[PDB]
């Protein structure tokens, strides 16, 4: 039959950079042009996800950073830049003829540490409030799967029954902060890169900050094409 | 500030049909040809799902159905067919320009419809086994979203962390099955047309049959170009 060989066994790239993975075949699975070998992705404990099928060609659903290249019995495959849930392992298969055949894959694993854990990014947020006319809150949201220096971390407000409002970012690398005019000096926040939390506090409230604010990072090596992944969402209330 | 505009408020689909939803920008939002609307589904008490980035771009693990289109100014999200599953508030978001606007949103809603039928292709597989060696297990492997009887029904095998192992296939509509050499008077691949399940069995056990089981549809009518769905997998174990 024919027997993919992929390299390396064992990847770890630092987030946001390239990737490089090969399977080589011994045979040509190569047919007029058309390699019959498909990418994999597997999560930890989950079934094998098809990404790219026939060398070059993206599943629908997978971005572009996913390249799909080889000729022969020569294949590569490449993700660039590498994001966080991207931890997994990587298979090759062939299906030029049968027995239809795997390769050994590459686990990959994001240099950011942790023999434990992949991937799966998640946010929590601090607990539902009840607050009174007066009052002031400052809402947490901790982050994990992903260091918060490399992304921006909004907050946006969301009244009952109504759109979303965002409200501002900041930046934990360098602590620069944007909030939109209306929010300047209202809402201020904040970020403890040794706690790896993003804070976000609201004064002097008003029936008018009832609502459920949620916390999503997007800006860099993290969420850079559009909100994927949103806190739960902390809910405050304000009541007279 | 670039104020989105979403329509109608909201709106009522039979399930089955089309459902289409516009989001207009009062001033473009387009890049050197690239529309930074996004698109995402919300359901009462969670947060905004990520469903459509840039103008069209299908967000990885959202179904086919969902659409995404427009230029500059005027943008359509277009669910087709509606599934139930679908009920709940769709928003646009602009990343143009801080602060990133959202629009009002729109509610779709199911009406009374006399029709719909339109199940994903989903693969269900038995539960975890536990058993002596020697003795001989068997999986099941139950599909819905198609028939089985329109293409092959392949198993692949996933010993405790390492590759996949193409076992072999069955064809639903003739008992024809094909096992790769190795697996001949150990594996035994049958299917029953009308329960439109699968059935894996492997005889007198071993400790290096300990592994991970998945069901895979491929060929013909159902995934024909590469193994693009899979069952989530029996785990099977042997220690007495």
């Known amino acids: 039959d024919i027997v993919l060989t992929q390299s390396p066994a064992s990847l770890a790239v630092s987030l946001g950079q390239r990737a490089t993975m090969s399977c080589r075949a011994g045979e040509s699975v190569d047919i007029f042009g058309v390699g019959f070998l498909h990418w994999y992705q597997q999560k930890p404990g989950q079934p094998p996800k098809l990404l790219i099928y026939?060398?070059?060609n993206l599943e629908s659903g997978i971005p572009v950073r996913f390249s799909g290249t080889g000729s022969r019995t020569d294949f590569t495959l490449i993700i660039d830049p590498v994001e966080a849930d991207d931890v997994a392992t990587y298979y090759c298969?062939?299906?030029?003829?049968?027995?239809?055949?795997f390769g050994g894959g590459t686990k990959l694993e994001i240099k950011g540490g942790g023999s434990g854990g992949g991937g799966e990014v998640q946010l929590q947020q601090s607990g539902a409030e009840l607050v009174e006319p007066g009052a002031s809150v400052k809402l947490s949201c901790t982050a994990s799967g992903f260091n918060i220096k490399d992304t921006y971390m909004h907050w946006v407000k969301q009244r009952p029954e109504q759109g979303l409002e965002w409200?501002?970012?900041?930046?934990?690398?360098?602590?620069?902060?944007?909030?939109?005019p209306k929010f300047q000096g209202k809402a201020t926040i904040t970020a403890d890169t040794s706690s790896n939390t993003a804070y976000l506090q609201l004064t002097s409230l008003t029936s008018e900050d009832t609502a459920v604010?949620?916390?999503?990072?997007?800006?860099?090596?993290?969420?850079?094409?559009?909100?994927?992944?949103?806190?739960?969402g902390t809910s405050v209330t304000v009541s007279s | 500030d670039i104020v989105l505009t979403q329509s109608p408020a909201s709106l009522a689909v039979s399930l089955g049909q089309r459902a289409t939803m516009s989001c207009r920008a009062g001033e473009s939002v387009d890049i050197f040809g690239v529309g930074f609307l996004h698109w995402y589904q919300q359901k009462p008490g969670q947060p905004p799902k990520l469903?459509?980035?840039?103008?069209?771009?299908?967000?990885s693990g959202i179904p086919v159905r969902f659409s995404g289109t427009g230029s500059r100014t005027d943008f359509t999200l277009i669910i087709d067919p509606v599934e139930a599953d679908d009920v709940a508030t769709?928003?646009?978001?602009?990343?143009?320009?801080?602060?990133?606007?959202?629009?009002?949103g729109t509610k779709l809603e199911i009406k009374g419809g006399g029709s719909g039928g339109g199940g994903e292709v989903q693969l269900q597989q038995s539960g975890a086994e536990l058993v002596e060696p020697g003795a001989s297990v068997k999986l099941s492997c139950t599909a819905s979203g198609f028939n089985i009887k329109d293409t092959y029904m392949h198993w692949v095998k996933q010993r405790p962390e390492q590759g996949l192992e193409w076992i072999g296939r069955?064809?639903?509509?003739?008992?024809?099955?094909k096992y790769v050499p190795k697996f001949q008077g150990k594996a035994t691949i049958t299917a029953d047309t009308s329960s439109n399940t699968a059935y894996l069995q492997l005889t007198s056990l071993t400790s290096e049959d300990t592994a991970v089981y998945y069901c895979?549809?491929?060929?013909?009518?159902?995934?024909?170009?590469?193994?693009?769905?899979w069952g989530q997998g029996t785990s099977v174990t042997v220690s007495s």
């Open positions: 026939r060398a070059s």
């Open positions: 298969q062939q299906t030029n003829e049968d027995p239809y055949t």
């Open positions: 069955i064809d639903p509509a003739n008992g024809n099955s």
């Open positions: 895979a549809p491929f060929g013909y009518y159902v995934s024909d170009y590469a193994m693009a769905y």
